[PDB]
RNA sequence: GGUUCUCCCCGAAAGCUAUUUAGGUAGCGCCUCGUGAAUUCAUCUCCGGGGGUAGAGCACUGUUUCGGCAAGGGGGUCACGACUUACCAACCCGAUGCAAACUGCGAAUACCGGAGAAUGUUAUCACGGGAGACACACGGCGGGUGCUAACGUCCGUCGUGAAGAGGGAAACAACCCAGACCGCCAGCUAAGGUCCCAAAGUCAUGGUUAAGUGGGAAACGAUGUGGGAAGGCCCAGACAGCCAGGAUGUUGGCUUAGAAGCAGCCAUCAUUUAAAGAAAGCGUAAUAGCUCACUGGUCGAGUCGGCCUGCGCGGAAGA
RNA sequence: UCCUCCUAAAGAGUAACGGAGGAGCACGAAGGUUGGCUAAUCCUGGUCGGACAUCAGGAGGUUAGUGCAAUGGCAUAAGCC
RNA sequence: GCUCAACGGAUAAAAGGUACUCCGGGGAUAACAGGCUGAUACCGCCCAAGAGUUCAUAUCGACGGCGGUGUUUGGCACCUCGAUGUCGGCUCAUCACAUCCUGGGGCUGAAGUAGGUCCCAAGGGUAUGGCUGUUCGCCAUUUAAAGUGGUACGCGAGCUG
RNA sequence: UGCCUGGCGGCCGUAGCGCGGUGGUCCCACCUGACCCCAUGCCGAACUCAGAAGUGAAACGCCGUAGCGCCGAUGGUAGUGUGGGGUCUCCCCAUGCGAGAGUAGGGAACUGCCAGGCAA
């Protein structure tokens, strides 16, 4: 359950998810999962995907998480009228743009890497693709 | 044997480059030395096939444009953010 | 427990570069000194910049710190 | 609530500030009539301007992942000297991110000023007489709020309705086209259309679709079908089929309860060899057993597995 | 009621029972002028003294300070005597 | 000389109840129903850790994900305040299928009887009483079953209160 | 006219840091003393006066070095005004404007006035 520590402000504006991803290349491992769609990932989804791969690889190799939530999201309690101030913070999400690399991995065969990432992508709400580290 | 067929670009800009890429053809630039930079266009499918191997960026390459041969080296290249395509290549004259 | 705010102070540049002004006219209203007084320009107690002579106002960057200055030339 | 004859000209607002004020009212903004004024004003070109928004970035304020160097901290050899570390870790260095209340960078537009041509019934400003209005709505764009729910709510800017008929979207104030002075059984066009209802192509050329898709809906699934770039094996004959082979210790030491390949510690040896592994599936308490990896012979020519995508199918149940 | 930032869309202004904080003072000096001075944080040595008192040197260049929350500004210092 | 702080300060000087109520208005503004929405609810599907004698997928399926319905609880305040009677019961019904029974099938950790789960199917059928105003629910005894919902949470110019 | 030096500027990191070399004829700095002028919240430290022995150590000026900072294209990309389109909580087309970062490269300054010494 990734979450920041002592953030400057409890609440922040909704904002927008326009634009294009920055971390579009593999930088740590040899294989990675790239985001094709656009959306937001909650902390729970990131944890679920991480657990799926660790089990798949059987604690062999290394796992890199290239996304952090660092964005609180509020939700009004049930049977509450509009207004009366901003809602309380419930969960943290990370905004994902197309081309963003979600997870990176190294130290395992390419064949075993594909199934591990496929299992993780099955527990994410955004279209994803498998990429390999490029030479320069 | 990295022989690349290239042509001199006629018009430049965001609109021109996007139109060029839509025709399965992407732009590139050659610079270096005391010669003016040369803007070129070249086929995309062929470059993808021969740039897959790791040693494409190792040794010098030869560019054939309008019957002139230029020896270059892959200096920089821009991928598509989420597709297996190329946006631009920077070539340094060797 | 929010909901409080202060009335806007309508700061900013009142006269822009290349337009003639009369002596004593306010050129820039500012909290600090974003622009420093140059030639024929005076600085008020609240860091307001006003014209000390009649002429055209111009902006420029001078000094080792590249700080912005406002001057007036008699034209 | 109601307010009675006609015609002509112009033509709003639903904003700001204040209010025991919020459905009232006052000043201003907007409308009208009159009077007086300066290339006064607008559009475009050029010139002079200051921004810190989009984007970007991580020097700074915060946050974030990995690797290194690692002061320092614990346990341990020492005789006031001093030392090691399987173990905790500061500050920094290299790489990767994030921010409305971060900025070592920084647009497009907008806004202010100056010069110039054309155009516009002075379209500008000042003063005077009379007002209405201060419940706005939807649409596009930039946002806050909500669930990036609401024909929701709150702001900025433009459009339309309000206060605008006509044509189009089957019907449909606010969507698209377009601003009705009157008459004509005249013509050309806009959006949108041309098989019939129903005005106009059953028009021409090249493709796709088999689904009534077109004429609602996702994750995801699949030898549907079209095209493109490649790649492996192929008449010293490939792929699928066809009568064939697939053995010997390896009932293992190992946790000896049996794992013997089919629970794992483990190597992942070695002969016959046209050919076979100390083991992939089904099946036994383990056995056994049946297949496939691989290898001979005939016919025999293409076949196999992925990527990019065009159009389709399933997923798809309501009175 | 008043002040600072954001929302606020790079002039000004701009709403919400939107997101964060403050004020109802203080000072005859904390004002005027003249003269002079330049921090925080780290490293090394040194009695008590110890991570953190004071002294000396070095890196540092304002991360300090500015009577009071925040923003902007401040070396010609608006900071200190 | 005023926390005249309700800070452009209506007086120097002021708190409550009305279901005994009254008048002027408003769907500019609530309560029942409709409408929009679908957070929540219900239903279906994707991945699959694991359970199931070994074996993920006979049967369940965590950590997560994607949809449908407008059946609950909600949001909005568009319609109605110059009036749309809003819980139960009775009588009378009608439609949907996400089927309770009957009918036809696949799989089964289906020996048979009896089951579990899924698919097709709406032709017909689909209780009586005790307690409570109750819907619901508990209880008693039957049946092949005593289905889930829509219809102004169907139906008061049809009845009861 | 040139090598130099000091002062006052323009310009402001291509101008600033790090390392090495170089300078005492003048000028500059350090330097001796300070009873008196002047000052230490103590100190000739700093400021000030009387001097010039000695020195180029430190500081300062100049030269070299890219080890850093810094500047920086062309091309592409992001964004964006106007007019259209879409499977419309995001994008695409025509046209106009066009970054930031990074890359090749540049880079260890230039210049005006006055005064003084040497050679001319």
Swiss-Prot record, chain A:
Keyword Translocase attributed: no
Q: Which residues carry this modification: (3R)-3-hydroxyarginine?
A: 81
According to its UniProt record, how is this protein modified after translation? Is hydroxylated on Arg-81 by RoxA. The modification is nearly suppressed when E.coli is grown in anoxia.
One Gene Ontology cellular component annotation? cytoplasm
Q: What does this protein do?
A: Binds directly to 23S ribosomal RNA and is located at the A site of the peptidyltransferase center. It contacts the A and P site tRNAs. One of the last ribosomal proteins to be assembled in the 50S subunit. The simultaneous presence of uL16 and bL36 probably triggers ObgE's GTPase activity and eventual dissociation from the mature 50S ribosmal subunit. It has an essential role in subunit assembly.
Q: Which family does it belong to?
A: Belongs to the universal ribosomal protein uL16 family.
User: Subunit info?
Assistant: Part of the 50S ribosomal subunit. Cross-links to the A and P site tRNAs. Interacts with assembly factor DarP(YjgA).
Q: This chain belongs to which protein, by name?
A: Large ribosomal subunit protein uL16
UniProtKB/Swiss-Prot annotation, chain B:
Stored NCBIfam families: PRK05943.1
Q: Member of which family?
A: Belongs to the bacterial ribosomal protein bL25 family.
Checking SUPFAM superfamilies in the record gives: Ribosomal protein L25-like
- Subunit and partners: Part of the 50S ribosomal subunit; part of the 5S rRNA/L5/L18/L25 subcomplex. Contacts the 5S rRNA.
The molecular function terms in GO held by this entry are: 5S rRNA binding; structural constituent of ribosome
**Entry keyword set:** Ribonucleoprotein, Ribosomal protein, RNA-binding, rRNA-binding
Keyword Methyltransferase among UniProt keywords? no
What's a single GO BP term from this record?
A: ribosomal large subunit assembly
The record's section on PANTHER family has: RIBOSOMAL PROTEIN L25/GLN-TRNA SYNTHETASE, ANTI-CODON-BINDING DOMAIN-CONTAINING PROTEIN, RIBOSOMAL PROTEIN L25_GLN-TRNA SYNTHETASE, ANTI-CODON-BINDING DOMAIN-CONTAINING PROTEIN
An example of a Gene Ontology cellular component annotation for this protein is:
cytoplasm
- One of its Pfam families is Ribosomal_L25p
Its biological purpose: This is one of the proteins that binds to the 5S RNA in the ribosome where it forms part of the central protuberance. Binds to the 5S rRNA independently of L5 and L18. Not required for binding of the 5S rRNA/L5/L18 subcomplex to 23S rRNA.
Q: Which domain of life is it from?
A: Bacteria
HAMAP family xrefs: Ribosomal_bL25
> Which InterPro entries is this protein grouped with?
Rbsml_bL25/Gln-tRNA_synth_N, Ribosomal_bL25/Gln-tRNA_synth, Ribosomal_bL25_short, Ribosomal_L25_dom, Ribosomal_uL5_bac-type
- Its name, as the record gives it, is Large ribosomal subunit protein bL25
Curated annotation (Swiss-Prot), chain C:
Question: Its Gene Ontology biological processes?
Answer: assembly of large subunit precursor of preribosome; cytoplasmic translation; cytosolic ribosome assembly; positive regulation of ribosome biogenesis; regulation of cell growth; ribosomal large subunit assembly
InterPro entries in alphabetical order: Ribosomal_bL27, Ribosomal_bL27_CS
Q: Give the matching Gene3D superfamilies.
A: 2.40.50.100
Pfam families noted in UniProt: Ribosomal_L27
GO annotation, cellular component aspect: cytoplasm; cytosolic large ribosomal subunit
Q: Molecular function terms in GO for this entry?
A: ribosome binding; rRNA binding; structural constituent of ribosome; tRNA binding
Q: Which UniProt keywords apply?
A: Ribonucleoprotein, Ribosomal protein, RNA-binding, rRNA-binding, tRNA-binding
Q: Does the keyword Ribonucleoprotein apply?
A: yes
Q: Which PANTHER family match?
A: LARGE RIBOSOMAL SUBUNIT PROTEIN BL27M (PTHR15893:SF0), RIBOSOMAL PROTEIN L27 (PTHR15893)
Assembly and binders:
Part of the 50S ribosomal subunit. Cross-links to the 23S rRNA. Cross-links to the A and P site tRNAs.
Q: Which family does it belong to?
A: Belongs to the bacterial ribosomal protein bL27 family.
Could you identify this protein by its name? Large ribosomal subunit protein bL27
**Organism of this sequence:** Escherichia coli (strain K12)
Q: Which gene encodes it?
A: rpmA
